[PDB]
Design a protein around this ligand. Structure first.
Ligand SMILES: CCCCNC(=O)N(C)[C@@H]1C[C@@H]2C=C[C@H]1C2
Length: 209
């Protein structure tokens, strides 16, 4: 059972600005997704201080970067707090509405797309490099869900049947044809070292076979 939803108008507007604006410094997408993973890990770490059973679904707090040249995908996996169905469908998009409006006003004032993180909507920078984004997520209080969008104004959410995650979030970037440089080990290392060197969780860059 796949449910289809319309993005809020302001968020659809942000995604098409991200997709259509000429902007060469696309690598900042990785910093934004890693920062998102770091916050999700902070959240479950804090919550587990007052309730250790919240780590029954997995004690390890880490971030994995998994390129796959065969599928042309880059996956960012974290074992953070995860996202409920209400998060995916409504809550997070609602929060993002005000940061979207502020971000788009700043861009009129001379700001540039690399400051998207200061407005809390860094996730959508994924569409600098991806034609389609799949997010698999599991929160302790909900089931495993798959969110997906190729932009164009709509996203889908379904219950996920694949491998159980335990807890956390997996962002699968289906890369545009001319953005395969972000599948290369030396390029990913360069970006992580430049923008994410002080992230307080182990970041493991997988290599391909
Ligand atoms: C925790 C790492 C992801 C942070 N998520 C966001 O910032 N969102 C706006 C959400 C991602 C999916 C698209 C919209 C919602 C659901």
């Amino acid at each position: 059972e796949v449910e289809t939803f319309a993005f809020q108008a302001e968020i659809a507007q942000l995604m098409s600005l991200i997709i259509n604006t000429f902007y060469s410094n696309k690598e900042i997408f990785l910093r934004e997704l890693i920062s998102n993973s770091s916050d999700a890990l902070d959240k479950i770490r804090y919550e587990s201080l007052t309730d250790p059973s919240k780590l029954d679904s997995g004690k390890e707090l880490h971030i994995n970067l998994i390129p796959n040249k065969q599928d042309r995908t880059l996956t960012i996996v974290d074992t953070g707090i995860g996202m409920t169905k209400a998060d995916l469908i409504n809550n997070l998009g609602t929060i993002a509405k005000s940061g979207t409006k502020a971000f788009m006003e700043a861009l009129q004032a001379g700001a540039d797309i690399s400051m998207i993180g200061q407005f809390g909507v860094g996730f959508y920078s994924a569409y600098l490099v991806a034609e389609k984004v799949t997010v698999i997520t599991k929160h302790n209080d909900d089931e495993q869900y798959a969110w997906e969008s190729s932009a164009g104004g709509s996203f889908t959410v379904r219950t996920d049947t694949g491998e159980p995650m335990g807890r956390g979030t997996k962002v699968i970037l289906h890369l545009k044809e001319d953005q395969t440089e972000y599948l290369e080990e030396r390029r990913i290392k360069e970006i992580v070292k430049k923008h994410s060197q002080f992230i307080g969780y182990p970041i493991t860059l997988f290599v391909e076979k």
